[PDB]
Write a protein that holds these residues in place. Structure first.
Motif, PDB file in Angstrom:
ATOM      1  N   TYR B  50      96.918 129.698  28.026  1.00  7.61           N
ATOM      2  CA  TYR B  50      97.607 130.705  26.941  1.00  7.61           C
ATOM      3  C   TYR B  50      97.110 130.086  25.569  1.00  7.61           C
ATOM      4  CZ  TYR B  50     101.621 131.859  23.885  1.00  7.61           C
ATOM      5  OH  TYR B  50     102.563 132.306  23.232  1.00  7.61           O
ATOM      6  N   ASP B  71      95.084 124.749  33.969  1.00  4.13           N
ATOM      7  CA  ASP B  71      96.363 124.709  33.093  1.00  4.13           C
ATOM      8  C   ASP B  71      97.289 123.992  34.042  1.00  4.13           C
ATOM      9  OD1 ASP B  71      98.668 125.637  31.877  1.00  4.13           O
ATOM     10  OD2 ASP B  71      97.307 126.713  30.752  1.00  4.13           O
ATOM     11  N   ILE B  72      98.116 123.478  33.351  1.00  2.00           N
ATOM     12  CA  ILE B  72      99.387 122.329  33.901  1.00  2.00           C
ATOM     13  C   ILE B  72     100.298 123.536  34.653  1.00  2.00           C
ATOM     14  CG2 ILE B  72     100.575 122.255  31.764  1.00  2.00           C
ATOM     15  CD1 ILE B  72     100.981 119.278  32.647  1.00  2.00           C
ATOM     16  N   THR B 112      94.161 122.993  24.436  1.00  3.61           N
ATOM     17  CA  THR B 112      95.737 122.509  24.935  1.00  3.61           C
ATOM     18  C   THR B 112      96.556 122.238  23.723  1.00  3.61           C
ATOM     19  OG1 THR B 112      95.045 120.472  25.494  1.00  3.61           O
ATOM     20  CG2 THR B 112      95.141 121.813  27.157  1.00  3.61           C
ATOM     21  N   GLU B 133      90.023 122.056  20.459  1.00  3.09           N
ATOM     22  CA  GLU B 133      90.567 122.687  19.478  1.00  3.09           C
ATOM     23  C   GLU B 133      91.631 121.727  18.538  1.00  3.09           C
ATOM     24  OE1 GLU B 133      92.710 126.527  20.566  1.00  3.09           O
ATOM     25  OE2 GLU B 133      92.722 127.078  18.497  1.00  3.09           O
ATOM     26  N   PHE B 212     106.578 130.915  29.133  1.00  2.12           N
ATOM     27  CA  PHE B 212     106.957 129.525  29.956  1.00  2.12           C
ATOM     28  C   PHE B 212     108.062 129.314  30.429  1.00  2.12           C
ATOM     29  CE2 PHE B 212     103.466 129.324  27.027  1.00  2.12           C
ATOM     30  CZ  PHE B 212     102.397 128.516  27.682  1.00  2.12           C
TER      31      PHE B 212
HETATM   32  N1  SAH Z   1      97.477 118.471  30.149  1.00  2.00           N
HETATM   33  C1  SAH Z   1      97.124 120.003  30.186  1.00  2.00           C
HETATM   34  N2  SAH Z   1      96.335 120.218  30.891  1.00  2.00           N
HETATM   35  C2  SAH Z   1      96.005 121.745  31.228  1.00  2.00           C
HETATM   36  N3  SAH Z   1      96.702 122.374  30.449  1.00  2.00           N
HETATM   37  C3  SAH Z   1      97.655 122.135  29.695  1.00  2.00           C
HETATM   38  C4  SAH Z   1      98.032 120.882  29.455  1.00  2.00           C
HETATM   39  N4  SAH Z   1      99.018 120.615  28.577  1.00  2.00           N
HETATM   40  C5  SAH Z   1      99.412 121.954  28.193  1.00  2.00           C
HETATM   41  N5  SAH Z   1      98.595 122.911  28.790  1.00  2.00           N
HETATM   42  C6  SAH Z   1      98.596 124.430  28.487  1.00  2.00           C
HETATM   43  O1  SAH Z   1      97.771 124.490  27.436  1.00  2.00           O
HETATM   44  C7  SAH Z   1      98.325 125.790  26.746  1.00  2.00           C
HETATM   45  C8  SAH Z   1      99.075 125.078  25.293  1.00  2.00           C
HETATM   46  S1  SAH Z   1      99.125 126.334  24.174  1.00  2.00           S
HETATM   47  C9  SAH Z   1      97.706 126.228  23.359  1.00  2.00           C
HETATM   48  C10 SAH Z   1      97.550 127.521  22.450  1.00  2.00           C
HETATM   49  C11 SAH Z   1      96.151 127.832  22.119  1.00  2.00           C
HETATM   50  N6  SAH Z   1      95.549 126.731  21.382  1.00  2.00           N
HETATM   51  C12 SAH Z   1      95.985 128.834  21.057  1.00  2.00           C
HETATM   52  O2  SAH Z   1      95.849 128.958  20.144  1.00  2.00           O
HETATM   53  O3  SAH Z   1      96.423 130.060  21.820  1.00  2.00           O
HETATM   54  C13 SAH Z   1      99.531 126.230  27.570  1.00  2.00           C
HETATM   55  O4  SAH Z   1      98.559 127.164  28.329  1.00  2.00           O
HETATM   56  C14 SAH Z   1      99.679 125.064  28.489  1.00  2.00           C
HETATM   57  O5  SAH Z   1     100.513 125.473  29.758  1.00  2.00           O
END
Ligand code: SAH
Ligand code: SAH
Ligand code: SAH
Ligand code: SAH
Ligand code: NA
Lengths: 258, 262, 260, 259
Positions: B50, B71-72, B112, B133, B212
């Motif tokens: 996401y 994804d977590i 993330t 990012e 979420f």
């Molecule tokens: N440790 C981890 N490993 C994998 N995915 C993760 C994580 N921590 C958070 N996430 C996932 O990463 C996303 C964070 S929101 C990221 C927003 C994205 N940069 C944008 O601009 O659209 C979510 O899908 C969340 O479930």
């Protein structure tokens, strides 16, 4: 994640609506100076009309709400208020003698009641709500508030503004939207805030196009703003919204006619 | 097309929330594409489905033999629209990295953001390229302190930081939905000042709640399928309504800044 | 004001106080990045506006501090005789024909259209700090900016960044940050109940410094209230609180640029 | 590859001129070409001077009255007679030369008293409403309605900025607000590094230093200075012009059947 906090304001959209409508009702109450009336006619049930009509029950023997939309009888929460659609009011005025109000309140605003219909009454008091907010050439041009203040021994114009802030109209809905929008802008500048989302939608559409007052009332029953932040912002969120609500100032300006 | 009466017009923007989301996600994907300079990879791992992750992973299918989204949240497999993208929850990735040999990416992309992947997990890879990012938008002391983007840029022969901002406008983060919200909010501000406008409504809600907390990707996608703004006015404003929104969308600028290292 | 029914209030905070707060934050950001290291010769490019105080702040740990400016009249903005002033032409001639210029600390505060990476490349210092003139994102400004190209020498490299937390500024320039603090403060002060109008005491400061070439006059121009307010009620407390809050948002730091 | 500095062609005095002209035209429109033997205008600063000048065409005698004698210096036409407030009050009590058929009160907040206005019996009375957009404090001290106490035809001069917020209708305030709003928009233009308005407490020069000449010199300055990477001359003037165009001035007739 747990690194970011989500905070929904305690203040709900309905609380902001309530605060605005109560200010309008109190402005009218203050202007009436405790005078008692035999029959009050209020034009325009949405949005403040319902509570304003309820507020007149104490000093008015009969309170009638008139609306061009028959389904708006659903926005009245007190069985003591008589609802009449515009066509039935016009028929009763012509065919009967039961309509002779001593208090007339026009809350229809832009594109509302005609001065011709208001001219058929001879009340002790006439109050016309001025829909104009801050200056806008287009709104000023379509507005005919002054032409509607054509009857009554005592005349008043109900005005509502946001002190030190810009709003295009005095409409309850517009004022609520503007309070929320201005609040979001300021909340977004608080340290640690990621984003601020106002919980808004085209509410008027639920009432006038879907003709569903119950669904509209449910839509107002929700937090005005949702904030995403790293730090706690609950008091700050409340400080900003509450200050914007307190800026609303409603008053009836007496129109002197010697 | 009218409001309470026929004296007032109700205008819904032709631009929908999803169109704004699409424009932002595509700019992020193009920024990555430009940075990769057409390099081909055997296995790409993208962390964070996401919101831009789904399209970014799809955009890598052309030059990557295998693309894996991690994804977590397991329910986020629902935000993927191409069966060619492999989905793995974080736990399965961690275990396969520690116990197997199938995970050895040559391209790693961390989307993330705040409170996301740890530099410790990123340090387990040895890719040709690493892109992280940067969730930071304009300066904020609180956000800058929790941010650890620089610590995540710890592996890879070529390293890049994906940055996204609104040129000459204020945004706290580079997050796709924050940028969309900000475009709509700034557009409403300007639209409200057009002559004859009574009020301007942004069609917004806590979209993160749908994704979420309610764990409903389908409902979230349906929520994006609606006009970004509704305007109540005495005169026609269709032209200005679309122009203001389009101008604000065009201000989005996404780019990967190369992080020099040997 | 015009009558006794209206009050005129001038802020206690002066323009110079805002300038002082910003320059001190930039100097402290450099101080913390240097970690108490001692240097034999520091060269600072760009005397206006924070350069003067930054050079003064280096006197404690640097045996020799030289300010270099393309404008010779800017020697007038230095308030300490311990700082050596050198115009750009003399520095360039001394680098090519002499051996007295060999700095161990180089600080570039010139910003947009300033010192060239070619001149910076002639040094071999222990530490190089380049001030990043960029504030919040602007396509036009990011295109002309060449901060990264200037960070081409030094065993330890840093980029000095300055922003207003949660507020919008196009650059990190001292005077621009001051202007922005005052402008944002005026906007909020104007919304206080009873305020008739709010006037920021601003002018084209660069005109005094760079066109009139009168540093003393410019310093006199900073010695005045940042804002004047016309109101029916007392607004002194709010006036100072708004300005102080906006000044506190300034955050300056040197981001280390890793080079193994 | 260079930073450009651009000063607006529009000067503070040009903005002042545009606002005062709108107020004068609003009065002209309301008067419908009526001719008067004697017009009395209270309040020389800031629009009063030009408004008095604009009445010379249809008024045989135009008198500006001000509580500050040094404000005679703000009049640019010798055809306008200046009288300080004490000299007007003296001539009203002991003489017969003051009997205006047109009275215009531009004093605003804390200005002329309704008691002094009540001494006249003009054909037309115009009172400038100093209120802009809503402010509780300003609304409370305002007594415009009490000043509309004489005249067969009564009007209230109102001045606002369409779609923009201003606390008062004062010429000064409106000019400051136009410049401030213009700076805010100019700063968001791509390539702009900084935007600076040339503003100061002008009222202090006029009323505390009592120096009209110095004040007029202070208005003879570019409204804004911009530093940018790209050319912005056209946009600088367009934003300022659009903000000036939002000013809308009109006289609202105050109906009174008895008069
Ligand atoms: N440790 C981890 N490993 C994998 N995915 C993760 C994580 N921590 C958070 N996430 C996932 O990463 C996303 C964070 S929101 C990221 C927003 C994205 N940069 C944008 O601009 O659209 C979510 O899908 C969340 O479930
Ligand atoms: N001619 C007419 N007679 C009676 N009701 C009318 C009317 N024209 C419009 N209305 C009703 O008046 C309301 C107009 S909306 C008014 C908003 C109100 N002033 C507020 O601030 O909340 C609607 O209920 C509409 O149905
Ligand atoms: N090539 C060069 N060498 C030395 N000084 C230069 C230069 N180009 C510009 N300058 C000087 O550098 C300054 C640019 S203005 C820099 C503003 C400063 N960063 C601040 O925030 O206050 C001026 O003093 C100018 O005269
Ligand atoms: N009682 C009184 N009689 C005459 N002039 C007065 C007065 N009280 C104040 N004044 C003058 O009236 C002016 C008040 S300022 C008015 C501003 C004007 N409405 C504008 O928009 O430009 C000043 O010139 C002041 O000296
Ligand atoms: Na009208």
């Amino acid at each position: 994640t747990e690194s970011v906090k989500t905070t929904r304001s305690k203040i709900k959209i309905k609380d902001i609506v309530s605060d605005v409508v109560e200010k309008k009702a109190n402005a009218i109450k203050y202007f009436l100076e405790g005078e008692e009336f035999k029959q009050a006619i209020v034009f325009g049930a949405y949005l403040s009309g319902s509570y304003i009509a309820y507020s007149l029950l104490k000093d008015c023997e009969e309170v009638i709400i008139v609306d061009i939309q028959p389904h708006l009888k659903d926005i009245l929460f007190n069985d003591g208020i008589k609802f009449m659609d515009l066509n039935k009011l016009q028929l009763e005025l012509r065919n009967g003698t039961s309509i002779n109000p001593d208090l007339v309140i026009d809350l229809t605003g832009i594109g509302g009641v005609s001065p011709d219909l208001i001219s058929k009454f001879n009340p002790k008091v006439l109050i016309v709500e001025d829909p104009k907010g801050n200056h806008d050439k287009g709104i000023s041009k379509i507005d005919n508030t002054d032409k509607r203040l054509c009857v009554g021994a005592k005349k008043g114009v109900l005005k509502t503004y946001r002190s030190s802030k810009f709003s295009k109209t005095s409409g309850t809905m517009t004022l609520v939207v503007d309070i929320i929008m201005d609040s979001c802008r300021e909340i977004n500048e608080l340290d640690s805030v990621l984003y601020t989302i106002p919980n808004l939608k085209y509410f008027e559409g639920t009432v006038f196009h879907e003709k569903n007052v119950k669904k509209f009332l449910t839509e107002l029953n929700m937090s005005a703003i949702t904030v995403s932040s790293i730090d706690h912002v609950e008091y700050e969120l409340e400080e900003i919204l509450s200050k914007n609500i307190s800026r609303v100032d409603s008053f009836v300006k007496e129109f002197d006619k010697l």
